[PDB]
């Protein structure tokens, strides 16, 4: 039936407290509501992840550390560095409970898909793909994407994770590196010095999972048309080789023109074409957010993509709502690319695509 939208006021307020994206969850929800898109979705309150759920991926020692520093927001605990807390991942007061709420929200979305409540379930505050079993990383404390995939494994036999965030989805890839039940596909900036430093085209997984990880390394300045060409070519091959039964799709908006990271040069329309390609498979699909550090642009992007999921054309004028002034001075939904070079050469992209095709022959 209609898509599930994971939401409650309390959940949004928790998500608004994440250190690197304050208020973003409220801006995203507010804009979706301003376009009245929530009236076309089934709103489902998220459940909080239990300790037992979190521990099916994360280690007890890491969960215990996170819970300890979370209680009073001890951002000066001497053991935080072993567990990845520090600059990227501060010990914000309450972060254990906020992260458990986000993990629970993604698990709730997955359960809705299993129950056949919907074909698409959305958690725009999820997508924290860098967290490791025993380590916070990259603004991620608990890996809600992994938790969602592990929930989907109850029913859906083969699962495709597609990560369109600017950064390599390394924590998800690592979690499933040794298995062939989950294929991971990440398109990301790959350049030495650029976080997290992994995900070359030669990274294909390990052991029994060899060839069940796909990485598409891309350079600065990519725009909508070339990005979609790459994404469609890879997903066509993956779909035919792997025959997934469910998809988890991470749509971090840090690729979008105007992001302070200033790396890719995408608009929501290009990402929307990738999303449409996946939706036409008509599989259970769990939609996640992720990065995105121009907050108004991230809200523009995810609102537009919610419209794509609903098959609706949205008005270009930003409607009046709580954060209307954040969209000035032009107050439009569309984003214009920057005037900078695309550093992706056609011969290199072709070689990457050919290398991936050769890998997928083994699948």
């Amino acid at each position: 039936l209609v898509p599930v939208y994971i939401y409650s006021p309390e959940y949004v307020s928790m998500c608004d407290s994440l250190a690197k994206i304050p208020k973003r969850a409220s801006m995203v929800h507010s804009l979706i509501e301003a376009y009245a898109l929530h009236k076309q979705m089934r709103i489902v309150k998220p459940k909080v992840a239990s300790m037992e759920e979190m521990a099916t991926f994360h280690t007890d020692a890491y969960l215990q550390h996170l819970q300890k520093v979370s209680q009073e927001g001890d951002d000066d605990h001497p053991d935080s560095i072993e567990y990845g807390l520090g600059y990227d991942c501060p010990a914000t007061e309450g972060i254990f409970d906020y992260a458990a709420a986000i993990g629970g929200a993604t698990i709730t979305a997955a359960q809705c898909l299993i129950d056949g409540m919907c074909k698409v379930a959305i958690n725009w505050s999820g997508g924290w793909a860098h967290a490791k079993k025993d380590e916070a990383s990259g603004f991620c404390y608990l890996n809600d994407a992994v938790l969602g995939i592990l929930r989907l494994r109850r029913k859906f036999e083969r699962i495709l994770y597609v990560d369109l965030d600017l950064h390599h989805g390394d924590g998800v890839e690592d979690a499933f590196s040794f298995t062939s039940k989950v294929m991971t596909v990440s398109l990301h900036k790959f350049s030495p010095g650029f976080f997290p430093g992994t995900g070359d085209v030669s990274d294909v997984g390990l052991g029994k999972g060899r060839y069940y990880s796909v990485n598409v390394p891309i350079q600065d300045g990519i725009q909508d048309e070339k990005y979609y060409q790459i994404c469609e070519s890879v997903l066509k091959e993956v779909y035919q080789a792997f025959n997934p039964k469910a998809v988890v799709l991470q749509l971090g908006a840090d690729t979008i023109a105007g992001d302070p990271m200033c790396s890719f040069n995408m608009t929501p329309v290009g990402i929307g074409k990738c999303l449409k390609y996946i939706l036409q498979w008509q599989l259970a699909t769990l939609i996640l957010g992720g990065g995105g550090f121009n907050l108004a642009n991230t809200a523009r992007c995810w609102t537009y993509l919610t419209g794509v999921i609903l098959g609706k054309t949205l008005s270009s004028e930003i409607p009046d709502h709580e954060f209307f002034t954040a969209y000035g001075p032009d107050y439009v939904l569309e984003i214009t690319p920057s005037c900078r070079p695309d550093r992706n050469e056609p011969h290199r992209i072709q070689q990457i695509l050919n290398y991936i095709k050769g890998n997928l022959k083994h699948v």
Partner: peptide
């Protein structure tokens, strides 16, 4: 380990 951020 890299810094993100």
């Amino acid at each position: 380990r890299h810094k993100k951020x």
